[PDB]
Each structure stands twice: as C-alpha cells, then as structure tokens.
Amino acid sequence: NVTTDVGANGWAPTVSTGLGDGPVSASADSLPGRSGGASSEKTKVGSRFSKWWEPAPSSTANPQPSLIALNPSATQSGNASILTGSTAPSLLAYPTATPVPLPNPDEPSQPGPSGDRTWLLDTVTWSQE
Amino acid sequence: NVTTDVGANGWAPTVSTGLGDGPVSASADSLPGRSGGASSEKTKVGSRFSKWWEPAPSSTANPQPSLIALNPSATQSGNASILTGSTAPSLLAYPTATPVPLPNPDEPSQPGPSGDRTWLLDTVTWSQE
C-alpha cells in the first residue's frame, strides 16, 4: 500500500541485474550454537570449502479496591518473598523473547538461587517537599 | 367466599330479567388503535350499521456492605451516566404495565436521546438543623 519500496525482507535475484537495480537488502544469518540472549527462555567442526593443497490488568469488569479492602499478593525469587495486603501492581513490562544462537562456544556459569534473588537495594525517604 | 355479590366481572343474561334483577356490571371495551399508555412497553374505516338511504433486593443471604467496601454500580440514560463506588439502592418502584389502544390516530413525536436522558434537576444543601 505504498509507492516506495519497503524491501522484500531479503535478497532476490531480480533486484540486482545488469539491466536494472533496486534497493539492496540484508538476509537473516543462519548460525549454529548455544541458545542464549533472551532471558527466562534460554536453555566435529569442518570448513565448507576445498583447499588448494588438499585432494487484563486494567478492566472495568474487574475493578481493584482501595487500600482498605483485603486484596493480597506476593512476589517470590530465590529464598526471598515480599507480601502485601492491598491492591498492588505487578507486571512484566515486556513479554520475554525467543532465544538466539551464541557466537561463543563456552558453557555459561550460573549463580542460581544465591544470585537470582530479591535483594534490598536501598532504603530512601520520600518527603512532601 | 362472601354472601354479597362482588360481580361476575361482566354482563350476564341472567342478571337483568323481567322476573329478577341483580347488580349491573360493566364489561371491557374492545377497541382498535395504536398501542400506547404504558411507558417502556408501548410500540379502510367503515361503520357497522346500515343507513336508511343506502341500499431479591433485601435478603440476609446477600448482605450489602457499608460505605467502606467496594461495591460499584451505575445508571445510564441517553448520553448521561452516574457512577458510585459503594452500596446504592436502584429500583423501579412498580413493574411496567401492558400497552393499550389509543383513542387518537396521530403518530407520536419522540425526542429520543436528546430528551430521554439524565438531567441535573437541582443542587441543594442538606444541613443538620
């Protein structure tokens, strides 16, 4: 629905020719390796060329009460837990993405429950000023 | 279950006779016309005689909370809406009745949403005196 060329999301034979030229595009790199990159979702070598020498949160149908009413929830991580007795927002801002092949071959070192836990980062004062 | 005559809810042949008379009663008038009268439910002429010249709201099983608790409801009419966050009475005092044939033949003029709407009738003060 546009006069401009948005790209065919890849490389086509009819794009670059000796009779006519269109805008060049990059294709997706197909790489092997260990799955990583995306958090909460991550879980013989030979060259391919011959050598010359080789042969809903917000909804009116579900209104959440004020501080007065009982509406408890909790957040847990590792051996840490934080409770509340009233309406509290608790949302993953963005949905988790799909894992990708890593360029490095080394196996990862994981801290586990000792690292992935809820830590008391800081205690601060909130004044009316 | 009464000694008195409450009426047979109509006109019977045995009521008025030359040998005996009972209390006369009126019958229902069967009339044609446009359906009207009852609100929220309303939606060739020839004479029948020859001429001489012619050939639960309140229930203990469902107790409604005080002003403190969340118990929202709303009332809408036209483009007007009134909300509340606590227990609120909202009752049609009497059930709507059945429509009746109108004596007048003219088609009604309706204001629609511009007329049937919730209007701010008045603002008044309620003192302890």
Side-chain angles (χ1 to χ4, degrees):
Chain A
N1 299 357
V2 295
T3 54
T4 45
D5 286 337
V6 296
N9 301 325
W11 177 281
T14 54
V15 175
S16 300
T17 324
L19 282 80
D21 289 313
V24 287
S25 174
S27 297
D29 202 352
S30 183
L31 299 163
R34 197 186 302 276
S35 53
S39 58
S40 299
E41 293 294 320
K42 57 192 177 183
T43 181
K44 191 177 286 179
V45 183
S47 53
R48 303 294 299 176
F49 59 94
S50 60
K51 310 292 182 290
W52 73 72
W53 61 90
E54 294 184 343
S58 186
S59 183
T60 55
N62 295 313
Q64 297 179 267
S66 62
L67 193 81
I68 319 162
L70 170 72
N71 192 34
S73 58
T75 54
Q76 286 180 348
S77 185
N79 57 58
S81 175
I82 298 169
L83 307 170
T84 179
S86 301
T87 298
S90 183
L91 188 84
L92 176 70
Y94 313 145
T96 55
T98 48
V100 295
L102 295 166
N104 52 302
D106 67 312
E107 195 178 9
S109 291
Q110 299 156 44
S114 58
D116 297 345
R117 201 178 62 91
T118 311
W119 303 77
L120 179 73
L121 185 62
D122 207 344
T123 305
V124 75
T125 321
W126 171 35
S127 184
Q128 63 179 351
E129 61 178 43
Chain B
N1 299 357
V2 295
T3 54
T4 45
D5 286 337
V6 296
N9 301 325
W11 177 281
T14 54
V15 175
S16 300
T17 324
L19 282 80
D21 289 313
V24 287
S25 174
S27 297
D29 202 352
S30 183
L31 299 163
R34 197 186 302 276
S35 53
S39 58
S40 299
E41 293 294 320
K42 57 192 177 183
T43 181
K44 191 177 286 179
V45 183
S47 53
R48 303 294 299 176
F49 59 94
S50 60
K51 310 292 182 290
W52 73 72
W53 61 90
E54 294 184 343
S58 186
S59 183
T60 55
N62 295 313
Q64 297 179 267
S66 62
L67 193 81
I68 319 162
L70 170 72
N71 192 34
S73 58
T75 54
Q76 286 180 348
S77 185
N79 57 58
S81 175
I82 298 169
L83 307 170
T84 179
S86 301
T87 298
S90 183
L91 188 84
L92 176 70
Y94 313 145
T96 55
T98 48
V100 295
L102 295 166
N104 52 302
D106 67 312
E107 195 178 9
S109 291
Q110 299 156 44
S114 58
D116 297 345
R117 201 178 62 91
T118 311
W119 303 77
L120 179 73
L121 185 62
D122 207 344
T123 305
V124 75
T125 321
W126 171 35
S127 184
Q128 63 179 351
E129 61 178 43

